[PDB]
Nucleic acid binder design. Structure first.
Lengths: 143, 63, 70, 141, 48, 206
RNA sequence: UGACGGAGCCAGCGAGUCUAACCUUGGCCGAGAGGUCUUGGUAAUCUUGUGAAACUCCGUCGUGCUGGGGAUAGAGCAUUGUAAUUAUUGCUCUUCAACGAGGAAUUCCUAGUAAGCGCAAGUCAUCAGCUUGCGUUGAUUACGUCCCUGCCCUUUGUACACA
RNA sequence: CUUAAUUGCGAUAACGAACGAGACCUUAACCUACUAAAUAGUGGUGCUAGCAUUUGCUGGUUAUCCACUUCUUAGAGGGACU
């Protein structure tokens, strides 16, 4: 097709490639899975009772190279809660920033997340040699 | 329902001390001269047809 | 109990037994049926996810389009 | 042929530029296909100048338009206008107008404020109320 | 025409009554529309 | 029909419908002309739309009050109570929903009889709020052909919260039975009996 | 057309350190609150692309005072300030209620405006449930009038002029 | 009689006026036509990694020649004067 970097869809993509990372053997968690509410405004524990850091291989790392240089609190910025703070406005509220800073040192070992100047993190030549050909794989297993 | 196929013949004016009833003429153009002296409720721009039931059952001043 | 319990093992598969004269399977209809609740009602109704009489063409959440179809 | 005329998708919330060149008919919002524009439904008001007077309209043109800033209406019209200016302001200067205007059976037949510049603009909020024309309520003694 | 088709000896009258009235000064301007006049216009006698 | 095939991603399901005939993929936006009588030349139908977004200057000109989309004049006419008002891209998919509930329960591929929503919800006379003094005054005038655009849209749509909110049941399915029920004779519904008090003393007192 | 959880993701206004320490992406730490070296900026340089909420899409919740609500008091951890008790604020858990559309009383407002929601600035060490603006999404129906209330003009009447 | 208007017409012991208001002025604006371009925004591509060969795309390059003024910004002006 001449599959470019930005032919990649957003939800039916992550349904069928981030679920493939569920059984790569990849534990790589800080030991703090299903103890975190994933928002200060959240009142309930999350869904699966194990894992769900496997979204980060197709939601986060796909969105780093949508831009060119990234940090952490802007990737924290997608998780947006609204703590019902008594009788007051429901102000700008993010999650706890420890997980994204420790995914920052968990999926770095693969070669996908590389050390960057011009601030924080940029994508590597594992992007143009695996992440391009999981845009040539996930869209080409879902043609 | 004896449907007198009414029409906006001319643009008569207003009534209503609270400004609610706007005046027109209402009859079918064939067999005129038998028509309620009556108006339309709200918005009507000029000179088109209308569907109704009554034909000639009048009143005069409408507050 | 009285309402919103588990599956009604007594009369379960109304989907393949009672969809003439009522083409209505949703959140908004199946709570006066003296039925299990949407905590576990439509979870017990996604058993026909491959095919079935009731069929969505709308993939959205929280209410689907389930009638007498083929 | 690429002389880039500096046509624009300009509305309430887009300072865009359309470099509508002449190619096969590919289109990228900096890389983006037609299936990714973020409403999932209001995408289908980009119907107007493409598949309603002609089938192809492809080998004549090529689209690659950026958008930066703004909000959430200019993905529908100001995306569309930048693409639509590359057709009738480029098949007019080179291709003839009777070839344009007699085959303009649908470019203007559904012209729901496309190329006419928008005249529905922000106005400053007042003083003494909640909103731009929303006041408080009073009280007496 | 259908009130008096019932009326044989057709319509019989064009029926009209007469009444002559006597108001006063103190009750005329609480029904009848004059209620004031100016200084130098109190001169006519025909009503139109 | 020998379509265009090309490398940049454009699918097939759009070009086999709209390149010659006005329609949508599974919806009908077809050949249905105005089956209902007058109020014709006041309706957005001719020219029908494909999906729902069209705005513009339709503010206070009394004398061009009918070229605006009544598609659009429907799709913002139920929203209130602090969270539904505003936010006006949320009914855009319920016309993708409830024009597939009528289009699955007695199909009538949707544009045939929904243009005919003046056949049943088109009044014949309306009783005024005229002054009088003392009673429930609806000594009346005769009807007007644009009150059948504002009173038509409202009283078939404002009943979508007296039956849905405070409990579990949604908006969509009661916009399907009570569209057909407000397109046929009803006797057990919301439109026709609320189409009574503005016609009750339209014949029992002239 | 709601709530929870995931996917995508939007503004403009600014005001920002001076011989002092303001805005600040990150690195690393710890669950947060946040903390130490660092990233740029006296300013279309950096904050900040203000990807925020409200929003779009896909899984989980059911007729209850409830996965709506968070009043009420209790314990602990931090931040600011020579200085926090009669608690500066937040954070994590204990406390988890009222209240169900609300009486003779009664306001505002006719197109990017009525409406929806949320960020700067203003007081700002710290303290927005406030007030200006900035914006992001946007219907209505009257299409105007004197009974109630308010104001100007003609005519008359007036034993009144701090009227 | 009209009007947002003591605004205008028309009647006229009046005529002609000075005000306020109106007028005037802004703004979110149209100007790819300009004096004009990375402390700011552009088709290009110096060095060109790669998905893909469906042959130019995703690109980056704390500047490589910097390609260029319309988008960003207005010096006066036009364009609209029911």
């Amino acid at each position: 097709p001449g599959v470019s970097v930005r032919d990649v869809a957003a939800q039916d993509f992550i349904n069928a490639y981030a679920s493939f990372l569920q059984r790569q053997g990849k534990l790589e968690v800080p030991g703090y899975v299903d103890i975190v509410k994933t928002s200060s405004g959240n009142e309930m524990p999350p869904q699966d009772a194990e894992g769900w850091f496997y979204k980060r291989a197709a939601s986060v790392a796909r969105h780093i190279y949508m831009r060119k240089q990234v940090g952490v609190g802007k990737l924290n910025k997608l998780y947006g809660g609204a703590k019902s703070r008594g009788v007051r406005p429901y102000k700008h509220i993010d999650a706890s920033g420890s997980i994204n800073r420790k995914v920052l040192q968990a999926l770095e070992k693969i070669g996908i997340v590389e050390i960057s100047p011009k601030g924080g993190r940029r994508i590597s030549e594992n992007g143009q040699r695996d992440l391009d050909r999981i845009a040539a794989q996930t869209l080409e297993e879902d043609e | 329902t004896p449907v007198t196929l009414a029409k906006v013949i001319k643009v008569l004016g207003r009534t209503g001390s609270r400004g609610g009833v706007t005046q027109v003429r209402v009859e079918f153009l064939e067999d005129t001269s038998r028509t309620i002296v009556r108006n339309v409720k709200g918005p009507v721009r000029e000179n088109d047809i209308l569907v109704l039931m009554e034909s000639e059952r009048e009143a005069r001043r409408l507050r | 109990a009285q309402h919103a319990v588990i599956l009604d093992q007594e009369k379960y598969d109304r989907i393949l037994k009672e969809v003439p004269t009522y083409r209505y399977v949703s959140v908004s209809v199946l709570v006066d049926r003296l039925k299990i609740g949407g905590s576990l009602a439509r979870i017990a109704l996604r058993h026909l996810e491959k095919e079935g009489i009731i069929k969505p063409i709308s993939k959205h959440s929280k209410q689907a389009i389930y009638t007498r179809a083929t | 042929a690429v002389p880039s005329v500096q046509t624009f998708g300009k509305k309430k919330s887009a300072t865009a530029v359309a470099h509508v060149k002449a190619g096969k008919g590919l289109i990228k919002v900096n890389g983006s296909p037609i299936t990714l524009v973020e409403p999932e439904i209001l995408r289908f008001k980009v119907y107007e100048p493409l598949l309603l007077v002609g089938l192809d309209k492809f080998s004549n043109i090529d689209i690659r338009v950026r958008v930066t800033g703004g909000g959430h209406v200019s993905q529908v019209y100001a995306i569309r206008q930048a693409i639509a200016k590359g057709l009738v302001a480029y098949h007019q200067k080179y291709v003839d107008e009777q070839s344009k205007n007699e085959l303009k059976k649908a470019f203007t037949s559904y012209d729901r404020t496309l190329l006419i510049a928008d005249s529905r603009r922000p106005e400053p909020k007042k003083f003494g109320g909640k909103g731009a024309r929303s006041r408080f309520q009073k009280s007496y003694r | 025409r259908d009130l008096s088709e019932a009326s044989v000896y057709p319509e019989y009258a064009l029926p009209k009554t007469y009444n002559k009235l006597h108001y006063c000064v103190s009750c005329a301007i609480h029904a009848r529309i004059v209620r004031v006049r100016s200084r130098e216009d109190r001169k006519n006698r025909a009503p139109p | 029909f020998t379509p265009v095939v090309l490398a940049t991603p454009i699918p097939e399901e759009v070009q086999q419908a709209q390149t010659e005939i006005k329609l949508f993929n599974k919806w009908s936006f077809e050949e249905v002309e105005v089956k209902d009588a007058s109020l014709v030349d006041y309706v957005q139908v001719r020219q029908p739309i494909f999906v729902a977004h069209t705005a513009g200057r339709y503010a206070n000109k009394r004398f061009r009050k009918a070229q605006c989309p009544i598609i659009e004049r429907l799709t913002n006419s139920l929203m209130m109570n602090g969270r539904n008002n505003g936010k006006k891209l949320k009914a855009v998919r319920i016309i993708k929903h409830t024009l597939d509930i009528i289009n699955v329960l007695t199909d009538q591929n949707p544009i045939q009889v929904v243009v005919d929503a003046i056949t049943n919800t088109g009044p014949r006379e309306d009783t005024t709020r005229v002054g009088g003094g003392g009673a429930a005054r609806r000594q009346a005038v005769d009807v007007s052909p644009l009150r059948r655009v504002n009173q038509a849209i409202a009283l078939l749509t404002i009943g979508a919260r007296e039956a849905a909110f405070r409990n579990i049941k949604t908006i969509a399915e009661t916009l399907a039975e009570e569209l057909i029920n407000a397109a046929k004779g009803s006797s057990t519904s919301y439109a026709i009996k609320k189409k009574d008090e503005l016609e009750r003393v339209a014949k029992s007192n002239r």
